[PDB]
């Protein structure tokens, strides 16, 4: 039986947490700041459902190109295409 892709298909592990986190993250993540051109890792936090990208791109590294609202604009290169996302800083982590 062929099954279409959806937001939460095969996410049992990818969007779980070690039972010792089990709650709100420390607040230095919600209050991050990045600059245009900075490289960021995409690391989804499963307790915040706002500003969350397709989990297919969990584990990738992109670059910041701008800002809209409280969300940052992140560009990735999927194969030979550029894709643009508006992601909340709680799902991001800087490279070095």
């Amino acid at each position: 039986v062929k099954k279409a892709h959806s937001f939460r298909r095969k996410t049992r592990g990818k969007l779980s947490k070690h039972p010792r986190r089990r709650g709100l993250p420390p607040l230095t993540r919600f209050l991050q700041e990045f600059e245009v051109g900075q490289k960021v890792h995409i690391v989804i936090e499963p307790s915040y459902h706002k500003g969350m990208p397709d989990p297919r791109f969990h584990g990738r590294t992109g670059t910041v190109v701008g800002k809209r609202g409280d969300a940052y604009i992140v560009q990735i290169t999927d194969g030979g295409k550029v894709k643009t996302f508006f992601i909340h800083p709680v799902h991001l982590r800087p490279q070095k």
């Binding site: 039972p19 010792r20 986190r21 089990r22 709100l24 919600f30």
Partner: peptide, 26 residues
Amino acid sequence: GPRYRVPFRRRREGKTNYHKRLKLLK
């Protein structure tokens, strides 16, 4: 045991509400 989440220190003490802290720091 290994599945017991130990709350933040200030929350154990009874001194800080982190949800309101977040809303105020926004």
